[PDB]
Write a protein that binds this ligand. Structure first.
Ligand SMILES: [Zn+2]
Ligand SMILES: [Zn+2]
Lengths: 11, 61
């Protein structure tokens, strides 16, 4: 898991 | 159990910053695709969406 991908939460 | 989205992006052949596609290779790059949005769930990389918009390129019957 970890921050493998960007997750800026568009919401 | 999450389908290990981490694996290898065919564009770089390296692992790092990759998204999981349901209609294509379990793992793919969002950077190489130049994606600035992070969609959740079955996401279609421009590659699958590009052919999806063209729909059946050939006419049926
Ligand atoms: Zn890549
Ligand atoms: Zn795709």
């Amino acid at each position: 898991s970890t921050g493998r991908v960007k997750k800026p939460h568009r919401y | 159990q999450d389908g290990r989205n981490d694996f290898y992006c065919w564009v770089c052949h390296r692992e790092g910053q990759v998204l999981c596609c349901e209609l294509c290779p379990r793992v793919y790059h969002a950077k190489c695709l130049r994606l600035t949005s992070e969609p959740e769930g079955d996401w279609f990389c421009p590659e699958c969406e590009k052919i999806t918009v063209a729909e059946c390129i050939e006419t049926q019957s």
